[PDB]
Design a protein around this ligand. Structure first.
Ligand SMILES: *[C@@H]1O[C@H](CO)[C@@H](O[C@@H]2O[C@H](CO)[C@@H](O[C@@H]3O[C@H](CO[C@H]4O[C@H](CO)[C@@H](O)[C@H](O)[C@@H]4O)[C@@H](O)[C@H](O[C@H]4O[C@H](CO)[C@@H](O)[C@H](O)[C@@H]4O)[C@@H]3O)[C@H](O)[C@H]2NC(C)=O)[C@H](O)[C@H]1NC(C)=O
Ligand SMILES: CC(=O)N[C@@H]1[C@@H](O)[C@H](O[C@@H]2O[C@H](CO)[C@H](O)[C@H](O)[C@H]2O)[C@@H](CO)O[C@H]1O
Ligand SMILES: *[C@@H]1O[C@H](CO)[C@@H](O)[C@H](O)[C@H]1NC(C)=O
Ligand SMILES: *[C@@H]1O[C@H](CO)[C@@H](O)[C@H](O)[C@H]1NC(C)=O
Length: 331
């Protein structure tokens, strides 16, 4: 394949699959992979995020700076894992106060972690470390690893989180992974999980699943991917705004990540890992990752049969949550 990622992924496949039979690590090589400047045509004219992605692609052994090791001391029914960024204090607090509160109704334990990388001063981020410690001490729901938290490193956020599940929360029945700007009807998710047979629950993976997508080739677009980096279609994948899957599948996904090179778009990467597992993510109508009709955004009854809606501001998540608590009496 002319495209770099495809070409390197095929090499991964043959080293994991003897049937294809007829040398730096791809997992813990953390010096720059200088070969990429020779083999990627036009490397020097690529945007900086692509250069950094290609150079350090073979490094994923980053450590936890802030951990909450007893977060799953009690076997959770549902683990909420919310991708966030250091400066988003308001987003995390609104989630804490609304749909992301930890609870134990009916002995079905819901626990919450926020997933962060570093926002270092060398990348011109303002220094908010003392406030992050303060937040972490008080609320004990911050997981932070020491990699550069960037758009193109969100696959790392995925792999490192899945590594944390296998080491520190392997008994959770279900996992919800989402962004910090979505509203999530946590009651409706609990009801949905309790209506699942165990056969169906075993390999559960549902979201707003996208079929037959391809890399955007427009150089101005957020999700632009040049032809020299990737070719072909994307596998089916749930939009990263939020998806829901079993803890048993989380263990299997973690194991399979070693066999899939990181990809700059994190929700495609999870789709690549599912496909390698022989699984197809399941589209569920309750995931509105492109939001609902504006006429309906007003009426709280519009949110009752929803799993999640993107996107909502901190104030709106709290307001929707408060109205939702009395939704059974007027809908
Ligand atoms: C995902 O997250 C990971 C982890 O945080 C990021 O990986 C880091 O990427 C940064 C670059 O953004 C790396 O830092 C760079 O290292 C280069 C090479 O350093 C080695 O070689 C020099 C010389 O041989 C040695 O002195 C050095 O000690 C190392 O042995 C530097 O050349 C880089 O630039 C430096 O000089 C330039 C001048 O052009 C200055 O502008 C810079 O500020 C800097 O001083 C830079 O230091 C870092 O090593 C990576 N960390 C790890 C653990 O691998 C990914 O970048 C990130 N991915 C995305 C897409 O964001
Ligand atoms: C079939 C098709 O092309 N559908 C597109 C979606 O791919 C696209 O979704 C976004 O895609 C990027 C990767 O390119 C990233 O995964 C985002 O999370 C995901 O939302 C959507 C918006 O570009 O449009 C659909 O038409
Ligand atoms: C990953 O492991 C290698 C080999 O043990 C080591 O050289 C490297 O520093 C590690 N990377 C990080 C980010 O710790
Ligand atoms: C919940 O668990 C407690 C043990 O802590 C048990 O005594 C109780 O019967 C359980 N209640 C329900 C409704 O499951």
């Amino acid at each position: 394949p002319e495209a770099y990622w495809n070409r390197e992924q095929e090499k991964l496949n043959r080293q994991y699959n003897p049937i294809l039979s007829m040398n730096i690590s791809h997992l813990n090589y953390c010096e720059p992979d200088l070969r990429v400047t020779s083999v990627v045509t036009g490397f020097n004219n690529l945007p900086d995020r692509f250069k950094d992605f290609l150079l350090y692609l073979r490094c994923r052994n980053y450590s936890l700076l802030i951990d909450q090791p007893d977060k799953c001391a009690k076997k959770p029914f549902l683990l909420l894992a919310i991708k966030s960024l250091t400066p988003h204090f308001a987003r995390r607090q609104a989630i804490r106060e609304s749909w992301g509160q930890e609870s134990n109704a009916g002995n079905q334990t819901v626990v919450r972690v926020f997933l962060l990388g570093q926002t270092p001063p060398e990348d011109n981020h303002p220094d908010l470390s003392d406030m992050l410690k303060f937040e972490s001490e008080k609320h004990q729901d911050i997981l932070m690893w020491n990699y550069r938290d960037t758009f193109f490193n969100l696959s790392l956020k995925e792999v490192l989180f899945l590594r944390w599940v296998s080491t520190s929360c392997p008994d959770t029945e279900f996992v919800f992974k989402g962004d910090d700007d979505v509203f999530v009807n946590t009651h409706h998710i609990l009801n949905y999980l309790n209506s699942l047979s165990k056969t169906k629950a075993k390999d559960l993976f549902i979201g707003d699943v996208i079929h037959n997508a391809g890399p955007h080739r427009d150089k101005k677009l957020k999700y632009y991917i040049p032809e020299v980096v990737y070719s072909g279609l994307y596998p089916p994948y749930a939009g990263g705004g939020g998806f829901l899957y079993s803890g048993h599948l989380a263990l299997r996904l973690y194991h399979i990540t070693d066999q899939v090179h990181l990809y700059p778009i994190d929700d495609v990467y999870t789709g690549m890992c599912l496909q390698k597992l022989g699984l197809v993510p399941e589209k569920h109508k309750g995931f509105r990752t492109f939001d609902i009709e504006e006429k309906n955004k007003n009426n709280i009854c519009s949110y009752v049969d929803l799993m999640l809606v993107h996107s909502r501001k901190p104030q709106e998540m709290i307001d929707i949550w408060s109205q939702l608590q009395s939704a059974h009496l007027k809908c």
